[PDB]
């Protein structure tokens, strides 16, 4: 015979710990509206137990602490009672501050501030609260740096990082860039702390597509595996990979360093899987870091393949794009196997909820980049279904505006609206602006003068929005992007590329023509090794050699070899016929001039069948 209602204190407390930890074991097993009330029943009990110990008992300062903390952790991760959790943490803090001069309470007091300034305002996700947290987090840091002890200098660095992380949430992007440098500039060089904060900076710039300043780029390259440890290093490797993919560079060296890494540290991510990364800044200042996609071996290879697959999207027609049509669906299944086989724990159900939600976004990237690979290879938007938001802002109304331009509809309305609204990334703003300048410049050529006064007007605007969003992002260092800017300027400011070329100076022609020479000399059907080389994008390579062959080539055997090629390429992707035609007129001249008789005859038949198709019913 046993009691159930007059229990030792350690039994009450171990029962709160059991109801929680049992929920942590059935977290990945909720499948019903019922099972949800079972999960949150076990949590309701655990919260109200910890409340009992706080009200119906006399607790020491260390027991108020370890208990109040364990309870607040659950309020924060399981409820919406954020106002409440902030009561407990401020009370515990205000109590610990009464005993703070006769008892050692720095770890507890810093951990309280961390809850008020970091853990809580992030779960709240409220601009009003963020704005207050920052007011307070600054007041804290501005106050601690005036204490010379080595502890308070390390805690200020911790809250200097909490200060930054909030500005990112408040989207105060200048403060972010300024503070990150003042924080990094103070950190002891080649320390795991500076290298973590730096990995945060680089990854912050990539999220906003900001250009990555040089010192940060070297700080990233100089990360040493043995000072930062396999978790943070697999993050450094992820970031470099992403940097290439962003400048459309080559990722072979990177996929190989990842293999050298994986050959000697795979078990670190599988055996240690779950235990996270702990950044010991000091004795009694240790921060834990969890990056689930990047740190767990399986979860990393799935991400890492989607990147390898997004680089090869543009190769599409008949080789490396066979890698993408083979490996984008495996992302989808290996991503789907990570959802079906999600295991607790022992973390909240909502921890596993959000890790599922990221897996669901990875699913949506794949259903997108298949529609893109189908729009490269076939020259039309498969549109299909509807119930998806696009894994990004308006990748749907970009895909949908493109389906309008494909249908000759101009889509000047859609591209301005998409590049006007603040929610869209800076890159998709640019893709929308170029396609606009392309359609507006096309009209200046093929429109009368009646409509042209208004349309010369538009082409000027849309060109400068492009001059802008290009100069403040990292696209300005992507060769495929800088070149597409050249191609379009020359096509619009030179005959015979526009019927009504736009006015320009002799200096501006000298500029752009000298540019094209660097691109042309380095990508023409005679391939090298340098910063001007381009991924084999079909439409891009074809225009570079029409444009370039037509302006910079003088020998006539040369000019025949090139136009022969450009002309045959155009069949590799769909939706290219009207370009194939303008190329065939060009080849047709070069044949007649060079007196290649038969060629002038075949090219006539090839052009006759294109006119037949271009004007079909």
């Amino acid at each position: 015979e046993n009691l159930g209602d007059k229990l030792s204190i350690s039994q009450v407390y171990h029962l709160a710990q059991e109801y929680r930890d049992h929920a942590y074991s059935i977290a990945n097993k909720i499948g019903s509206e019922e099972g949800l009330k079972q999960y949150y029943g076990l949590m309701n009990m655990s919260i109200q137990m910890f409340q009992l110990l706080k009200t119906k008992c006399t607790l020491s300062v260390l027991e108020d602490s370890k208990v109040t903390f364990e309870m607040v952790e659950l309020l924060i991760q399981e409820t919406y009672n954020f106002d409440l959790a902030e009561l407990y943490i401020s009370s515990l803090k205000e109590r610990l501050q009464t005993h703070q001069s006769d008892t050692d309470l720095v770890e507890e007091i810093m951990r309280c501030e961390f809850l008020l300034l970091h853990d809580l305002p992030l779960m709240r996700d409220s601009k009003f609260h963020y704005k207050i947290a920052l007011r307070n987090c600054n007041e804290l840091v501005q106050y601690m740096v005036n204490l010379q002890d080595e502890l308070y200098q390390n805690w200020a660095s911790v809250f200097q990082y909490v200060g930054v992380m909030l500005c990112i949430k408040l989207k105060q992007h200048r403060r972010v860039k300024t503070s990150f440098h003042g924080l990094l500039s103070q950190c002891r060089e080649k320390s795991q702390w500076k290298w973590f904060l730096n990995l945060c900076y680089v990854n912050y710039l990539l999220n906003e597509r900001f250009p990555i300043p040089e010192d940060a780029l070297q700080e990233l390259r100089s990360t040493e595996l043995h000072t930062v440890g396999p978790e943070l290093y697999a993050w450094k490797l992820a970031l470099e990979m992403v940097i290439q993919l962003c400048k459309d560079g080559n990722i072979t060296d990177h996929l190989n360093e990842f293999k050298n890494f994986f050959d000697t540290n795979k078990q670190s991510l599988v055996t240690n899987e779950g235990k996270g990364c702990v950044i010991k800044i000091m004795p009694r200042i240790a921060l834990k870091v969890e990056l689930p996609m990047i740190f767990h071996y399986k979860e990393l290879k799935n991400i890492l393949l989607l990147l390898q697959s997004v680089s090869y999207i543009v190769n599409c027609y008949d080789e490396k794009g066979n890698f993408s049509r083979k490996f984008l669906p495996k992302v989808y299944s290996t991503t789907q196997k990570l959802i079906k086989n999600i295991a607790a724990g022992g973390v909240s159900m909502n921890e596993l909820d959000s890790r599922i939600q990221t897996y669901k976004s990875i699913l949506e990237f794949c259903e997108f980049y298949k529609v893109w690979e189908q729009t490269l290879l076939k020259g039309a938007v498969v549109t299909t279904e509807s119930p998806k938001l696009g894994p990004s802002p308006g990748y749907v109304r970009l895909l949908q505006a493109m389906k309008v331009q494909f249908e000759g509809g101009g889509a000047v309305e859609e591209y301005t609206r998409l590049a006007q609204s603040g929610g869209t990334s800076s890159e998709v703003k640019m893709i929308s602006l170029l396609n606009c300048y392309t359609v507006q410049a096309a009209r200046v050529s093929r429109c009368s003068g009646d409509k042209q006064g208004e349309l010369v007007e538009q082409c000027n605007k849309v060109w400068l929005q492009v001059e802008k969003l290009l100069q403040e992002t990292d696209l300005q260092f992507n060769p495929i992007w800088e070149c597409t800017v050249t191609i379009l300027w020359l096509f619009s400011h030179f005959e015979p590329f526009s019927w009504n070329p736009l006015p320009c100076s002799d200096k501006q022609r000298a500029e752009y023509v000298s540019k094209l020479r660097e691109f042309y000399s380095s990508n023409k059907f005679v391939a090298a090794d340098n910063r001007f080389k381009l991924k084999k994008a079909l439409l891009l390579q074809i225009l570079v050699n029409y444009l370039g062959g037509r302006m910079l080539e003088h020998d006539l055997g040369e000019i025949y070899a090139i136009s022969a090629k450009c002309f045959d390429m155009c069949r590799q992707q769909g939706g290219m016929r009207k370009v194939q035609y303008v190329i065939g007129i060009w080849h047709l001249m070069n044949c007649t001039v060079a007196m290649r008789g038969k060629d002038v005859a075949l090219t006539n038949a090839k052009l006759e069948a294109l006119v037949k198709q271009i004007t079909s019913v």
């Binding site: 994986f262 290879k301 393949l305 495996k330």
Partner: peptide, 4 residues
Amino acid sequence: FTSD
């Protein structure tokens, strides 16, 4: 390539 492609582990498991």
